[PDB]
Subunit: 175 residues, 4 copies
Amino acid sequence: ASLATCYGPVSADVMAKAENIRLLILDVDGVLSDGLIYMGNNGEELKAFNVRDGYGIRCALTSDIEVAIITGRKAKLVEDRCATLGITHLYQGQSNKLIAFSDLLEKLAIAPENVAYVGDDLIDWPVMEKVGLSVAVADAHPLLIPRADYVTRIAGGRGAVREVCDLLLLAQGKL
Amino acid sequence: ASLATCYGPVSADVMAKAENIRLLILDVDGVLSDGLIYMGNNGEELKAFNVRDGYGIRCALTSDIEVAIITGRKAKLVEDRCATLGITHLYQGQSNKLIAFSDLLEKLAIAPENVAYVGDDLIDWPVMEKVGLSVAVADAHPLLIPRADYVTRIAGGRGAVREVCDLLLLAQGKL
Amino acid sequence: ASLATCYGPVSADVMAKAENIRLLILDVDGVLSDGLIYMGNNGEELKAFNVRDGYGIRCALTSDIEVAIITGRKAKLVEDRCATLGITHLYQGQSNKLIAFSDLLEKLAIAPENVAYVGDDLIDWPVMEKVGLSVAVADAHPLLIPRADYVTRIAGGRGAVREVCDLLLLAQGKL
Amino acid sequence: SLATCYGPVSADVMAKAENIRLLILDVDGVLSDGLIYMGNNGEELKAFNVRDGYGIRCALTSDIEVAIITGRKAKLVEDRCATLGITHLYQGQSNKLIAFSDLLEKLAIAPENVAYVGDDLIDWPVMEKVGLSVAVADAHPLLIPRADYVTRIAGGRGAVREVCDLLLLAQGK
Ligand SMILES: O=C(O)[C@@]1(O)C[C@@H](O)[C@@H](O)[C@@H]([C@H](O)CO)O1
Ligand SMILES: O=C(O)[C@@]1(O)C[C@@H](O)[C@@H](O)[C@@H]([C@H](O)CO)O1
Ligand SMILES: [Mg+2]
Ligand SMILES: [Mg+2]
Ligand SMILES: [Mg+2]
Ligand SMILES: [Mg+2]
């Protein structure tokens, strides 16, 4: 009931859950980035994405695992990042993340148990509570950590998404 | 005599001080930001803010805790940040922080004991000496750390403000 | 046998491989860079390089070791980075790293055993497997690390390239 | 044998620090963490620490001159100097001894009256000559054993503030 991965051992329950995943949902801030928003004196805004996560996302997409993003902010740079990686299911300016989640379930003809969610803060928990595989990144808010099925060894924006992508592909044979 | 929080145990005295807080005063550099200034050849000036802190701030503002910012310089990026966060008490170009402190206290009909202040350097101290709850961020200057009522576990720009918000709400039964 | 370096002891086999190196091939992402891509709302893209790496590369170039870059996509910033350091052998937009590798060896009339390659992800392996000295940076993908002849103590974008330059120069009596 | 807020320092380091009339700083890896942000439009950024700034401002208002000798050339460094009130700036310096010499004559001081905070081997020719040589915590490995003092704080994280704090303590400020 416990299997070796290149990040350390995971339980067979987590691995069984990962095998059923058809949709991976991600936060942006704190998951794809480290949480920082860079702001300038005339409208300049930057975010830092991890390139190893991008390969993870590319691999998932070419391996029949849809990737969606549900974020509370609206930013063209996020639209650019998604468009460069081939992510189409982008949801911006979402206060209540449950709406987009239900939308995704219907559009993909998919059940909550076929969904994985990678989050870092308590606003993600209403959705995380419902999905097949809930994941907190290593440096998520302290109260979210014990609530997840799986906690990543790698921090948000440092390869946390790559780790999850690696896990899904290992569980589904496709690695 | 001490209580559990999600960041670690705190003393009863710190909790008793946090229960009484009606105003949270924050610095920009080293508290909301990572303490760095990102400068370019086009004259760009960027500061990095953390997504973890803003959720905390919005929760505080909706839970009858006013949030103010007192800062020594004048920057549009700081104006832009407050607008986004819902902060209407912004004091820029403040050499003498006690002036802003007195203004705040008369403007909100509040006593010094109802005020919390999060700082990171020695310039913060004259105000911190007056407040009900003085807070130093984890990576504050070594000489400020021992003077503060509370030292956060999280460093500036990494969610230290969130920690303080989490603390105040917990103490006031709104976490 | 083993030998002291300023980063820690190295095996005589690694030192022996480093003695024959006439060409150092470097990745951009996660090797020369911190592995991040900084993106902006109005189309900005930035990558962070490290000053410790630059001095090493120029020492290498002036000490009979060519330095080359093979990379996935075309970017002005990387072109600019190569001009500053004096790297003339730059392959951009290379989907197949093996083709660039072949052209590189034929252009410089060098045998694969006289080549070192520094990587951070699994895509680098096909080329790293053919060279005389394979190097993985300290924070490379966990599956790449055990395969490499040498794993740097220093993380990509923090002086890992300098560490490798220092090794090659040490092995050849030039540090 | 002497306590500071960053930890114990030797009386020897403190004596050297008492005599300092000029603090020379590297930019890359001392005032910043060594990273150079470069973009597709030719943007170049660097990250400075604000706490270092206050330290620098205290040094200048406390009869200690502050100078910058750097191998790179950038307007952003000029901008940072103007903010801090640093007037002695030497950019594009392949050989740091030439700027060093210039400072000695302009300020009418001796090498023993100088402190140098460095991060890499290029700094050693100058560091070898000064009264107080300083390596930042995360400087090049070979540089560290050579300096009179090694900071607890890493470059771009407050190492300069620590040196300024040390100089002011030694000179009774
Ligand atoms: O970082 C934050 O404090 C904040 O609440 C500020 C908002 O501008 C926005 O960045 C918000 C995001 O919705 C989180 O991704 O975070
Ligand atoms: O950061 C470097 O690798 C580099 O070599 C880049 C060069 O442009 C030059 O600025 C150099 C300086 O000598 C270090 O500040 O650093
Ligand atoms: Mg988040
Ligand atoms: Mg401050
Ligand atoms: Mg790479
Ligand atoms: Mg340097």
